Design a protein around this ligand. Structure first.
Ligand SMILES: O=P(O)(O)OCCNS(=O)(=O)c1ccc(OC(F)(F)F)cc1
Ligand SMILES: O=P(O)(O)OCCNS(=O)(=O)c1ccc(OC(F)(F)F)cc1
Ligand SMILES: C=C(/N=C/c1c(COP(=O)(O)O)cnc(C)c1O)C(=O)O
Ligand SMILES: C=C(/N=C/c1c(COP(=O)(O)O)cnc(C)c1O)C(=O)O
Ligand SMILES: c1ccc2[nH]cnc2c1
Ligand SMILES: c1ccc2[nH]cnc2c1
Ligand SMILES: c1ccc2[nH]cnc2c1
Ligand SMILES: c1ccc2[nH]cnc2c1
Ligand SMILES: [Cl-]
Ligand SMILES: [Cl-]
Ligand SMILES: [Cl-]
Ligand SMILES: [Cl-]
Ligand SMILES: [Cl-]
Ligand SMILES: [Cl-]
Ligand SMILES: [Cl-]
Ligand SMILES: [Cl-]
Ligand SMILES: [Cs+]
Ligand SMILES: [Cs+]
Ligand SMILES: [Cs+]
Ligand SMILES: [Cs+]
Lengths: 258, 395, 395, 258
């Protein structure tokens, strides 16, 4: 989790915001995915959010459902995702790496064993999309024991109890949910700081450079963008692919200076 | 925090995205308030009696037990309006939705009995209803499809994933993730996140309550065992609930064996899967070694589901209830047997429960035993399925 | 000579070949003895309750009468085992057969609800059953066909004549002419030679008896009118019988108008035919000028019959009961209306009765009236018919 | 009815029995049917039994059902049957002519009017297949008022009440039913004579010369044969037709001498 804390220090020291893209690991293939991920970091991504293919991606809309399907068509398994994670970390020592998991993949072989593998490969955080704070105790405990930041969702209309629990339970960054529904509001940022929460990133629907500067100005530490990157992978399903995502990322990160 | 315990031992819980927790908490609060509201209970009883037709008959089977010491009764949920036990709890949930001031209904269905039940309750009570159903399911019970839209329901085929019941389930939570603010999600079985396993049990428990009153009237004692098929768990827990504290009454749930458990083409996660987290609950699942959810298989669309409700996993764990499996061929034989010797055409789902009762009788024909089968629905919807099978054979 | 009056005024009688008179006299004697036998009555009541599901619900329609002074209840014979009122009287007749020491059953059917009822009663009570059905009918409700043979009944398509219900009727009497000695002919409506109009009424009169008890419980008074479709007459006389001496209760029977009475493609002999002798009775018939029996027509196979039972012709003649007609299009509208606003899918036969109740409400929406429709069966058997019609239109 | 009484007198005066065939009027056509009927009388038929096509011939099996269908295919109506009857009678003054009717054709335009037409054309008797003695009162009364013999069926197992009513109500001849069922026992003959019944003819299934001599020996006044003639019409559906029925009738009537 200490990579996130060094990144955020070196962004407001820069008076800058974070831009964090999401891709599904192994989409559209293993070797290809590693090239997209390298292009994302070179194009200026501050951190990564990486999805492990799951049979039933319940919080994901059609854009990322098909990302999972494409990865499954390539034979991508969780074990091979952790081999990819090891290679990504070995090339990029400082880039924070967050995983987007579903509960059954974390619980399958033992919760502690899962987080132990995350630590061994150099993962910095884990968001489990279908574990609310109410159910999170064994997951966040195993995460902290293995130096993994557990990431929690802060929904738009969130009560004060939820803001306090997210602030106390989370590490690395606070996921600011921007709407309801599935993949495809400034009043909470100050209260999160009041309770010493991990820095907030807004996500879940961001697709153009407009939203980033808006979030940085709202005092949010940065933004996350999911389907927009996958759609760009989607639009150009190989050489013209990589140039398409490189162009997108720089516009996003330019907007985080102000 | 919650008003009610969300777990049955280690099974259950609320494994949903944070965005949906207020909806579940709202539903739990409405349910607890309704359960204490005599006016809600009066309205629910009125619909059950005067619209759905409760109490349902308890029919003693003379012919099929001849020559044995088994007495077999069938709890006739096949006589309920709509043709299955699904109708009971949609009427309660539809009232819950209205209690919350909600005006739209979301439902999932594979066999279509629950979607038809959702549509008919919504037609009667003035709710706008939309139903998710695996597109592979829309092809094979087009009858049930046309029944829902005759009743003004919007039917939405599912292309994601395997295009079947589990995929239909994920679409519903996906949609409800959109806006629970105006819609209520009418989950169709005793599974999913809390409070649904609790609500569906309580809205089905009249099956067992009536069975107990009726067996006592006709035999002067409790049954030796009550037997029910288990797709997600609603008719079985509806049968079981009122007998759980009568410790001499066996509680037997029947999972689909499909082509045979050893083939892996089956729907029996409780005895042959292992614990996982999916569909908002921690419960037995059919899953790959690395935690992907498997596809299940049953001749009967309504049992074809790779998990099971958490209260059954718990009743199994402590030994209160026993679970077995019945194959396709065995269910087909019990279907034919009931048609020919009692003049009742049972749902293939219920035929699994019947098949296991017939096995208990046939294996030990001099064992004195008083049995009840939850006959959860009628098999008019299956006669095309059964005909095509019979035609591929000889006969 | 006979034990009971074979006529209703000028209608009725026993117009059968001499060879069949002993069979009719035997049946009449068995019926009179059974009606006085409390053990027979106890057995019949037990089957009706515990096997068929009686009493059936009386459902108040809220939505479809909104904005009018009509209160409309539906007597839910659609909830009876088998899906129609046909089941009531086959259980009584099957017991009569056993009382006579007979072991085989002959039945006729057009829609198939009566053949299915015959087969299920025979499956339950150990009778060998064979069913005559116009071969044109076997093609369009193959569902009901397969239901009968699943239940062990022999189904015999009819090639003689028009190959429809009336032809099926003649095959049955032809066969029973063969040997009544071992077989009982289970006539499926309140028509044919004496004693069948009397027997079928008495074995259906629980429809009206329950309706009267239930309306009095729910409204504290008798209905203003009871409305029922009329194919041969059984569900209507079953509804009517217990109200005949309550002179303030209107008795309204609905014949099929088909494409329109003026087209001549209809099934309404009581108001638009004339008296003749056929099928063992003197009653209104559709016939040519020179006395040939015409072919009738209705969208609903179960109303498509060119005569009517003699007690209805008599009740009409003295003004006790009134008879009207409802066209195909009107019946189709009431079918859709009930699906969409009450979540009940009615038989197209019953939809004629519903259509006329809706007309009484709509024509005079400020007239205060308490109405009961005999909902004689469910319309699952019709959804294919309705779909093809809807597809030929737009929608 | 007086033709029957003259025929039976002139048969036992001959020490002979009657052979009475049945055909459906207008089968297979109007002009053709008149030729079959002429051949039947020339071949030696003592009397005729003639069917008027009816939509629903309930007492008739497939052989004669199809006879009715063939006549309907020719457009044969009851009115045209009565024109045929007038022509048959005008050629054959002494041959008794019986009609096989169904109740609705007799009742349709008025029972009395029907029998009045029978008398006008020279019909001698009418058997209404679906009117038992229990229902027969207006039919036999109208028959007797118009000098038409009402013919009644005596079933094999018939009680003494039925034997007495048939004996008292009938005229011309008593139809001795030979089995149950539809178109396709000596103990009763003496009791019929004891009650002064019209002479008995056995029918309803006779198809070869064996049965005739058996009936005459049993003291029955003769025999009737239905489907056998129609089947012969059936077998050869035109010139070879007529020779086929001529051959059949003579064998039957030869057997009535003894
Ligand atoms: O751009 P979008 O809207 O497609 O968002 C990308 C989604 N990828 S992700 O890892 O951020 C992400 C984050 C949270 C999710 O569900 C949860 F909120 F319940 F946790 C699902 C995916
Ligand atoms: O040779 P078969 O067996 O076909 O008999 C010929 C039939 N023709 S008929 O006019 O004698 C004849 C006589 C009686 C009939 O029914 C009834 F007995 F009820 F009256 C029907 C036809
Ligand atoms: C899955 C569906 N039906 C299930 C079903 C089942 C299995 O569901 P439960 O385990 O919830 O009873 C049993 N019996 C009948 C007649 C059923 O229709 C459905 O209609 O979607
Ligand atoms: C003619 C048939 N059915 C008749 C029928 C009728 C008309 O028959 P009665 O007039 O005897 O009720 C009414 N309602 C339903 C559901 C029916 O199935 C039959 O099943 O053969
Ligand atoms: C009642 C309410 C909440 C609970 N959480 C766990 N058990 C409970 C009982
Ligand atoms: C299993 C799973 C989900 C269901 N929804 C309705 N019935 C079901 C059975
Ligand atoms: C009772 C018995 C026989 C009858 N025939 C006419 N009316 C009667 C009444
Ligand atoms: C009309 C005529 C005959 C019938 N048999 C059964 N139902 C009928 C309706
Ligand atoms: Cl913190
Ligand atoms: Cl726990
Ligand atoms: Cl209740
Ligand atoms: Cl369809
Ligand atoms: Cl009379
Ligand atoms: Cl009774
Ligand atoms: Cl079929
Ligand atoms: Cl005489
Ligand atoms: Cs037994
Ligand atoms: Cs299951
Ligand atoms: Cs009203
Ligand atoms: Cs009719």
């Amino acid at each position: 989790m200490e990579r996130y804390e060094n990144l955020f220090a070196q962004l407001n020291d820069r008076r800058e915001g974070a831009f964090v893209p999401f891709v599904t690991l192994g989409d559209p293939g293993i070797e290809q995915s590693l090239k997209i991920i390298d292009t994302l970091i070179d194009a200026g991504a501050d951190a990564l959010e990486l999805g492990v293919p799951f049979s039933d991606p319940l919080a994901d809309g059609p854009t990322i459902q098909n990302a999972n399907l494409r990865a499954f068509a390539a034979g991508v398994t969780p074990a091979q995702c952790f081999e990819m994670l090891a290679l990504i970390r070995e090339k990029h020592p400082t880039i924070p790496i967050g995983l987007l998991m579903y509960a059954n993949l974390v619980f399958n072989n033992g919760i502690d064993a899962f987080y132990a593998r995350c630590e061994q490969v150099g993962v910095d955080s884990v968001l489990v999309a279908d574990v609310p704070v109410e159910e999170s105790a064994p997951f966040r405990q195993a995460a902290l024991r293995h130096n993994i930041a557990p990431i929690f969702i802060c929904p738009p209309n969130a009560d004060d109890d939820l803001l306090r629990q997210v602030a106390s339970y989370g590490r690395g960054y606070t996921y600011l949910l921007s709407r309801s529904g599935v993949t495809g509001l400034h009043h909470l940022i100050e209260k999160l700081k009041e309770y010493h929460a991990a820095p907030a990133l807004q996500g879940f629907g961001i697709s153009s450079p407009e939203q980033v500067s808006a979030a940085v100005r709202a005092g949010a530490a940065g933004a996350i963008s999911g389907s927009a990157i996958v759609k760009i992978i989607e639009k150009n399903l190989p050489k013209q692919m990589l140039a398409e995502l490189r162009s997108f990322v720089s516009a996003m990160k330019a907007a985080s200076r102000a | 925090t919650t008003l009610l315990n969300p777990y049955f031992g280690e099974f259950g819980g609320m494994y949903v995205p944070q965005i949906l927790m207020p909806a579940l908490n709202q539903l739990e609060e409405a349910f607890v308030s309704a359960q204490k509201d005599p006016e809600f209970q009066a309205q629910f009883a009125d619909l059950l009696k005067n619209y759905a037709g409760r109490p349902t008959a308890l029919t003693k089977c003379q012919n099929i037990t001849a020559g044995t010491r088994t007495t077999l009764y069938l709890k006739r949920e096949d006589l309920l309006h709509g043709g299955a036990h699904k109708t009971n709890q949609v009427l309660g949930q539809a009232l819950l939705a209205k209690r919350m001031g909600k005006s739209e209904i979301i439902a999932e269905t594979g066999a279509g009995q629950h979607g038809v039940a959702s549509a008919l309750a919504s037609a009667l009570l003035g709710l706008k209803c939309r139903i998710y159903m695996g597109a592979k399911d829309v092809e094979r019970q087009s009858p049930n499809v046309f029944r829902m839209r005759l009743m003004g329901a919007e039917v939405i085929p599912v292309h994601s994933g395997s295009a079947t019941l589990t995929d239909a389930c994920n679409e519903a939570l996906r949609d409800w993730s959109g806006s629970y603010e105006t819609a209520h999600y009418m989950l169709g079985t005793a599974a999913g996140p809390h409070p649904y396993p609790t609500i569906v049990r309580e809205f089905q428990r009249m099956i067992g309550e009536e069975t107990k009153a009726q067996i006592l009237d006709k035999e002067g004692r409790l049954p030796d065992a009550v037997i029910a098929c288990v797709g997600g768990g609603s008719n079985a827990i509806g049968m079981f609930a009122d007998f759980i504290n009568d410790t001499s009454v066996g509680l037997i749930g029947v999972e689909p064996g499909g082509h045979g458990i050893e083939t892996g083409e089956h729907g029996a996660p409780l005895k042959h899967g292992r614990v996982g987290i999916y569909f908002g609950m921690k419960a037995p699942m059919m899953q790959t070694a690395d935690g992907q959810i498997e596809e299940s298989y049953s001749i009967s669309a309504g049992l074809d589901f790779p998990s099971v409700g958490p209260q059954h996993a718990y009743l199994n764990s402590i030994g209160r209830a026993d679970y077995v499996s019945i194959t396709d061929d065995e269910a087909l034989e019990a279907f034919k047997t009931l048609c020919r010797h009692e003049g009742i055409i049972p749902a293939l789902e219920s035929s699994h429960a019947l098949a296991h009762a017939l096995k208990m009788m046939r294996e030990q024909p001099e064992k004195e035993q008083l049995l009840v089968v939850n006959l959860s629905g009628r098999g008019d919807k299956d006669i095309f399925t059964v005909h095509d099978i019979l035609k591929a054979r000889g006969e």
